[PDB]
Structure formats: C-alpha cells, structure tokens
Amino acid sequence: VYIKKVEARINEEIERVMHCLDKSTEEPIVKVVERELISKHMKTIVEMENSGLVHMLKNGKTEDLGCMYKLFSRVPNGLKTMCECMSSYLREQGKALVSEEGEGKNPVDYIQGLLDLKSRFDRFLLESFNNDRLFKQTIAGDFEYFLNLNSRSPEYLSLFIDDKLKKGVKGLTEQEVETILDKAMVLFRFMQEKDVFERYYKQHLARRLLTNKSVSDDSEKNMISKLKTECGCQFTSKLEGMFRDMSISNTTMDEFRQHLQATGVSLGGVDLTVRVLTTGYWPTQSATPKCNIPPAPRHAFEIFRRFYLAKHSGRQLTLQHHMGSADLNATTRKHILQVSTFQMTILMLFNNREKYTFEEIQQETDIPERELVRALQSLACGKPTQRVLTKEPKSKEIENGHIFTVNDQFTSKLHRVKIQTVAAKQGESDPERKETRQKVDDDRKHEIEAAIVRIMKSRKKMQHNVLVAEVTQQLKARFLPSPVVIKKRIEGLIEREYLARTPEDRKVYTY
Amino acid sequence: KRFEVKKWNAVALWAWDIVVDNCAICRNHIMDLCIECQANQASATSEECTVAWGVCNHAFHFHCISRWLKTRQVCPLDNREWEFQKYGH
Amino acid sequence: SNSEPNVDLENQYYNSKALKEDDPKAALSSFQKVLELEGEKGEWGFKALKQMIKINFKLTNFPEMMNRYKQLLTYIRSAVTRNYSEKSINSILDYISTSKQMDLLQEFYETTLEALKDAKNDRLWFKTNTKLGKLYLEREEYGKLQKILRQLHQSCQTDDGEDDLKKGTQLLEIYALEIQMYTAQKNNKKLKALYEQSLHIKSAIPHPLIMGVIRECGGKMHLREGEFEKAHTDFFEAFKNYDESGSPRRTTCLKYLVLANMLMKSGINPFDSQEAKPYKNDPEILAMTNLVSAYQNNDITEFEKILKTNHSNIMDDPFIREHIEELLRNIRTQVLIKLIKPYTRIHIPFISKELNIDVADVESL
Ligand SMILES: [Zn+2]
Ligand SMILES: [Zn+2]
Numbered sequence A: 001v002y003i004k005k006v007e008a009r010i011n012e013e014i015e016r017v018m019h020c021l022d023k024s025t026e027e028p029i030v031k032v033v034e035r036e037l038i039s040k041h042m043k044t045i046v047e048m049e050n051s052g053l054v055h056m057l058k059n060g061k062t063e064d065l066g067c068m069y070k071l072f073s074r075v076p077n078g079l080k081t082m083c084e085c086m087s088s089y090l091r092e093q094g095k096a097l098v099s100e101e102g103e104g105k106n107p108v109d110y111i112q113g114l115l116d117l118k119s120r121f122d123r124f125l126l127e128s129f130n131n132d133r134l135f136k137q138t139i140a141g142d143f144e145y146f147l148n149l150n151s152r153s154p155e156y157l158s159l160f161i162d163d164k165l166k167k168g169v170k171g172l173t174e175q176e177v178e179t180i181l182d183k184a185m186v187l188f189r190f191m192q193e194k195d196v197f198e199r200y201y202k203q204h205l206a207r208r209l210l211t212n213k214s215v216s217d218d219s220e221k222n223m224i225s226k227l228k229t230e231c232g233c234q235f236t237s238k239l240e241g242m243f244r245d246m247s248i249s250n251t252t253m254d255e256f257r258q259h260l261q262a263t264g265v266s267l268g269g270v271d272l273t274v275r276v277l278t279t280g281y282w283p284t285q286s287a288t289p290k291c292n293i294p295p296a297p298r299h300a301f302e303i304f305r306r307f308y309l310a311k312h313s314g315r316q317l318t319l320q321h322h323m324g325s326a327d328l329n330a331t332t333r334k335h336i337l338q339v340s341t342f343q344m345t346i347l348m349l350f351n352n353r354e355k356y357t358f359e360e361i362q363q364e365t366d367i368p369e370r371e372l373v374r375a376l377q378s379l380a381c382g383k384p385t386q387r388v389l390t391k392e393p394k395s396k397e398i399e400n401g402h403i404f405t406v407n408d409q410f411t412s413k414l415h416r417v418k419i420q421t422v423a424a425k426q427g428e429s430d431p432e433r434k435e436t437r438q439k440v441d442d443d444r445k446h447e448i449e450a451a452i453v454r455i456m457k458s459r460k461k462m463q464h465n466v467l468v469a470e471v472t473q474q475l476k477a478r479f480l481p482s483p484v485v486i487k488k489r490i491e492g493l494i495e496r497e498y499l500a501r502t503p504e505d506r507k508v509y510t511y
Numbered sequence B: 001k002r003f004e005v006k007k008w009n010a011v012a013l014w015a016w017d018i019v020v021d022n023c024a025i026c027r028n029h030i031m032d033l034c035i036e037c038q039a040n041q042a043s044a045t046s047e048e049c050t051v052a053w054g055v056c057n058h059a060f061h062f063h064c065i066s067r068w069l070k071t072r073q074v075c076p077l078d079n080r081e082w083e084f085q086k087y088g089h
Numbered sequence C: 001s002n003s004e005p006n007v008d009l010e011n012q013y014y015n016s017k018a019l020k021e022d023d024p025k026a027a028l029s030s031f032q033k034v035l036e037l038e039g040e041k042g043e044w045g046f047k048a049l050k051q052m053i054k055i056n057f058k059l060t061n062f063p064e065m066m067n068r069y070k071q072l073l074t075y076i077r078s079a080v081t082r083n084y085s086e087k088s089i090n091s092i093l094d095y096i097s098t099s100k101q102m103d104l105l106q107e108f109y110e111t112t113l114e115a116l117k118d119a120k121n122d123r124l125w126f127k128t129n130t131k132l133g134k135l136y137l138e139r140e141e142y143g144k145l146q147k148i149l150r151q152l153h154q155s156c157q158t159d160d161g162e163d164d165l166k167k168g169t170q171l172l173e174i175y176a177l178e179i180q181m182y183t184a185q186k187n188n189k190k191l192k193a194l195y196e197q198s199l200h201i202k203s204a205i206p207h208p209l210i211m212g213v214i215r216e217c218g219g220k221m222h223l224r225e226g227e228f229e230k231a232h233t234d235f236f237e238a239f240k241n242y243d244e245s246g247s248p249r250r251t252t253c254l255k256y257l258v259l260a261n262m263l264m265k266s267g268i269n270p271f272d273s274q275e276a277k278p279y280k281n282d283p284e285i286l287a288m289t290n291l292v293s294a295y296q297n298n299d300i301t302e303f304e305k306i307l308k309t310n311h312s313n314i315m316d317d318p319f320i321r322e323h324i325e326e327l328l329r330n331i332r333t334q335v336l337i338k339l340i341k342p343y344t345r346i347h348i349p350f351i352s353k354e355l356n357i358d359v360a361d362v363e364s365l
C-alpha cells in the first residue's frame, strides 16, 4: 500500500506546485523531495522483504509489478537493484528446480515446469516492464547461468519436441503449433551443450521415421528450417542428408513403380516397398550384422541390388539387420500378420516346414542374440486371445525343445493384426547415451585443436601467456575456456614439432 | 502353406567407392605418391601422404587437394562444399 | 506403447478392401456404409473416401467423386493430421491423371487449390503450387506460372520485406521455377538477379534436384562472366545433387563440370574419381574422358584429333563451342611452356611444326 500512497503524494505535490506557483519553481522542490523519499523508502521496503519484490512476484501480482516499474524508472539505479533482486529470486527458483539430489523425477514434467516458469516470467515482463531491455538481458544471463549446471536438459528438450512432433493431437490447427515451436526454439536459444541435444534429435528422427511413415510431412520442413535459422553447421548437414535420403527413397519408389508397370517377368515382387538410405546419415547402430534373409525378401533385395548396380552404378549396397517391417498373410478367415524383419526368418523356416524348435531356428538361420528372443516371444509369449504361433509347453520362460503350431483364432477378425512388442520404451538406456557423449566429447576435443592450429598458423605466438587469450576468445562462443585443461594440453605436443616448446626449456618453439 | 509373406518395408544401406586408378592435381595415380613428394624415401616417416576422400566421394591425395585449397583460392570447394570424410584408401 | 484406434471400422474397411476386387457396385456401397458407421469425421472412413474416389474413377462416376473429394479436403483440416493426407491426395491426383479429361483434371486441381487456400495448408500448399509450376515448365507455360510465382512471393512477403527467414525453402522453389523459366527465355540479367536473390535468402533445407538446378544456373552464369572457380564449384554441387537424385541432366551437368575444371588451368582432372568404370566408360562421357586424358598428358595432337572426331558431341553445345577456342589456347600455351622449359634460344618454325599450327599463331602465343 505504500507505493500507491507515494504515487498519490507525487501527484498531489506536483499538482499543488503547478497550480499554486510559477514556472521557475516546480522542478527543484519535487526533484529533491522525490529523490530523497523514494531512495530511502525504496531501500528499506524493497530490500527488507515486507510485501517485497520476491513476494509480490511469487504470488503473481501484475498491477503491483507494473506500478513498481512505472515508479522506479524515474530514479536512477532503481532498475539495477530491481533486476538484481529479480535475478536472485530466479536463481533461488532454479536451484529449487534444477536440484539433482533425489532420483525419480519425470523428464517431460521437468521440462514442462521450466517452460511454464519461462512463459510466466515472459508474460510478467510483457505486462509490467513494457519489454525493457535490461530485464531481458538479466533474465537471459540468469538462464544461461543456472541452466548449464546439468547435462540432461537437452535430451529432455529433445524428447519434448519429439512428443510435440509425433502427432498434433493437441492443437490441431497451425497457429498454436507455430507459437509453441517458436517458444521451444527460444528456450533452446539460452541453452548450452548443443551436441547432445542435436544427437538426441537425430535419434528421435530415426525412431519416428523407421517406425512411422506419416509423422508430419509438413512440419519436418518447419523443424529443419528452424534448425537452419537457429544453429550453425555441425549436424544441420546431418539433417540435410537425412532428408535427402527420404527424397531419394521416394524418387526410387516412383521410378521402380514405373519399372514394374513395364512387365516384371517372374512373381515374388507382389507388393514391395524398398527404400534407399545412405550410410553417412543413418548410422549402423552396433555392428552392421550379417543375418539371413527370407526368400521373398531375398528376391526383393536381389532385384533392388541389380537395379542399383545397373542404373546407379559407382556404389555398392551393404546389408544390415535392424529396421523394416512386413505383412504376413496367414490363414475361419485369412488374417494378415506383421513381422519386423527379425521373426520373418523364423516364419521362412516355418513356411518350409513348421513344428520346429529353438534349436532349428538358431542352427539353420545364422540368427543374432537375445534380440531374437524378444522377436520370437512376440508371437507366443504374452499374447492375448489372437495367438498365431502357439506351443505345447505353455510357460513364461523360453525353453529349447519346444514345438510351435498355429491356431486359426477366428476371434481375430482384424485382417491387419500386428504384434508391436518392439518399441516398448524410448528412454534411451545409458549405454547409447554414454557412447554418444564420449563421441561428442571427442568431437569437441579435436575441434578445439583444429581451431587453435588454424588460428595460430595465421597469427604470431607468445612467451608465457599471450596466445591463450586469443583461443579463449575464439572458443568463447563454444564453451568455457578451461584454462587448466588447455595449459596441460599445449605442453603435450613438445615431444613432437609443429611449434612445440623444446624439452630442455619450454620457451623456444619449432617456428 | 500356413504362413505367407505379403509385403516388405526393408531399409537398404549403400557405400560409396567409385574406385579408380588415377589422380587429378599430380596426374600420377590414386596411390604411389604425388608431384610434391616423388619418391618413397627422403624424410617420409612411413610415408605421411595418404588419400583424402570427400563427401562427394571424389578421391585425391591429401597433399594434392590440400594445396589446391591453400594455394590458388579457398573459395572453390570450401568447407561448405568439400568435406573431409576419410583419410586413406 | 499401443493405442486402441477402433476395431469395427478397421474390420469393415478391410472387408471392403477385399471386396474391391469383386464387383465395384458393392465395394462402393460398403465403403459409403463405412462412413455411415462412425458418421462424425472418418479416420478409417477418411481412407474409405479415397477408396470410393478410386473405384468411382474406375466406373467413371465424377460428380459425387468430386463432392467426396471436397469432403476429404475438409477432412485434411480435421482430426486426421495433414501428414498422410498429402500422400493420399497426391495418389488421388495421380489416379485422376490416368485418364485424359483435362477439363475434369483442372476442375479437380482448382477445387484442391481453393480448399488448400482455405485450410492454410502452407507447406502442402506451396508444394502443390510448385508441382503445378513444374508441370507448366514441362509444357513451357508462363501465363499461369507467373501468377503462381507472384502469389508464392506475396505469401513469402513479410509485408515490409519481400522474404521470410524460414520460407527460404519457399523462395528456393520459387527461384527454381524462375530458373527453369529464364533458361527457356535465356535471359542472362534476370538469371543473375535470380541467382543473387537465391544465394542471399535461400539458406534453408533444399530438395536435391532444386539445389542442383540452382547450382547449375549459378555455374552457367559464372562461366558466362568468366569465373572458373565459382563455376566449377557450382557444377560440382549440381552434379553431386544429380548423382543423389538420378535426373537425366546428370550427364549434361557432368560435361559442364568437365569443361569448367579444364578452364581453371593448374592441371586438374574432372574425370578422375566419379568418372569411373560406370561413368568413365560411358559412351557419352568417354569423349570427355579422352579429352581430359590428353589434357593431363598435354598431347595437343591427340586432343585436336578427338575434338575433330567427336565434334558432334564436343562443340555441339554452343557454350562449349565458344569455350573451345580458349581451351585450345590454354593447352597450346601449356605445351609450348613445357617444350621451352628445358632449354633456350629455339627457332619459331620448329615450335610451329611441333604445335601443328601457323607461325603467326605461335608468335602471338
Ligand atoms: Zn599424392
Ligand atoms: Zn612424399
């Protein structure tokens, strides 16, 4: 209530002096009065706490913040302490939110809370501070300060954007989608460690493209355009190649449709969907496996390889076993199944002759490890009353000498029943996270060496501590200078040449 | 049969080779040194001169296209157009 | 993960899919009854509408076909995301394209255009307009191409600015259309203006064919002006894009790249790597391979013999015809310099006989 009283005091004083006196008066009296009173009472009341800035900002009082901004703008050094207190409150809130102690926190909920806090602060700024530059700079610096204390935030943002991109069930129209994407990229602007963020974005791209074929078809372009306008060129070229692969895949699809429109000699190519992807934009995953191929898939792969070596010569295909899908026409009705490129070898062995066992499908298949077990248990283990691959030894755990049969199961009226045992979770189990963290760390560790050599080859040198400043300046936009690490690393090249330092005395370099 | 495969949605990966037996800047060969090094001996230290591969799969000696990027100009096939995707054949 | 979509809708949709190979009169009725099952929207009835349009196109039933296509256009801006609807409508347009009733084809096209305008289907919309523009260029049409270009540019206009920052791909497609057009009218000034505007604002994700076309135009402009490095780089990127895509323009772009790389002097080879057993031995590229082989070997006599032997595919291009004089001058200069390096004080007629040219040309060189 003091702020309204002092504003009324200012208004009444200025009105009384302007109506009751001359023009050469006014400014001195009101100037000194407001100076002294505002300075003293501001100090006391807005740095004590009593209905202070922290409390009036926590509960969300828009009028109080607006009147405070409009009153404190007249006196110098008021906005400075206002922004300092706001930054202190933001630091406290972040430390209460970015707390690492305690396991069992939801990533998407954490990102949603951070985004809600950012949006609330932006709304308060727009409503009260009239888009002041100082407040924006202070909040940006504070976000940069409290956001880089961890390393799981970028992956959580990636999973949030994957959830927003997989389906636009929330916000069917386009305006709100555009606004939320803009807010997401604005939040990403004040974020560090872009390497792991973009790696997880590529992982989400691989997950959504190799399992879904109708993701957005219109928002992918918007996503990658925002990446172009936001990031530089490190993995944006990776995304370029990723989309180039889809373009070439559809061009190959239509030209192959023209190919089978002109005859086709034998059958086996009944209904095929072959795709062309490059190795430099889609990673292997683990090892480029060498498993077997079912017969109709064998014919399809042979035809595709012959075409690619005939009309796209100069490059050879490499076979791998991680991705794909197929429809298995089974047969009282004819229900078509779905096999994800792994159990279809077992179904090949069954097409030749069923009533096999685990030994039969592990000996005459060149089949991989426990991923085989997960693929095989899809048709038998954990199955509802639409079982298509039944066994006599009904049990949960998998045996070796167990026979497989078939049940018609007329209850399965669905003619495109699928068994989606794969893609149970998308949590990115530690192994791959750690390996890609090591990969991006090595990427940074050789990028810094490339920068230091490329710059100091076009520049001069130092005696004790001159060049470190230039490399920190040119790596300022990348990450922290890390003086100890660079100091320990620059002296490791002395056992070689390229402007070393000389073992006997570290001061004469190989110029 | 009791089961029959109808469709397939395979993913086919491919690798880039365009293997040839000639060079461009030194006019000698893909391997067996270049104009700036001639012989195998005379301070090679296991012949520190290998083959450089670009994103477009074109192949040159590392030294050849390195001096190409250094001597005449850097703009033709710069870091935006020509990448460094491999080292050695 | 899993999500129960619907059981009965899928069951009847598959029943009608099986029925489609039977008499179409019953398949259409069953598909129309699938839309009656849910009533509101469609989901599986969305695909049922597409199947009904296909079967009606089989038995030449267009009026209700277009009414139900309007229903699908309204369904695009519905619970069905505008993701698979674009592929579905591309397939419907291709199916309509099977027949030859151009009036019906363009009625379909205009209804689609207006519906997509109403649905603010920005990406889908300029994709459709770009496809229409490519069709017009393939038929050398500019009356409606100009209108489409103006509309797309206005959509790209940020009021004060004539360009956005994320509609860079939009302007990229627009400039690809205009590059094809001004290749038809060979307007050099408009070509350079387009290339400059593209280089500045186009920075975005390209489609490989579009990037290849724009880089081909840039290389043409640069080698028309005189820049050899820029033209070589542009032909390089265009030929890489053509290698990725597969367009027939790959051979012509490779020939232009071969010409450009020979003009930057300093002894570089364009047939070395990509022109291999597949491409080096290509009948249309073997002549260029032999030319650059002679260029490497500095064999002026063999080079001129190959020029005269394959003149129907060496200087046939008016541009290569223009540049053959400069190429001959450069190769003769290189041979002369190599010949006169090891010694001094050499007579002119011997050089003229070695170069198989006139004495005056030797003196001028
Ligand atoms: Zn070399
Ligand atoms: Zn050497």
Ligand SMILES: [Zn+2]
Pocket (backbone or CB within 6 Å): B052, B053, B054, B055, B082, B083, B084, B085
């Ligand atoms: Zn390279």
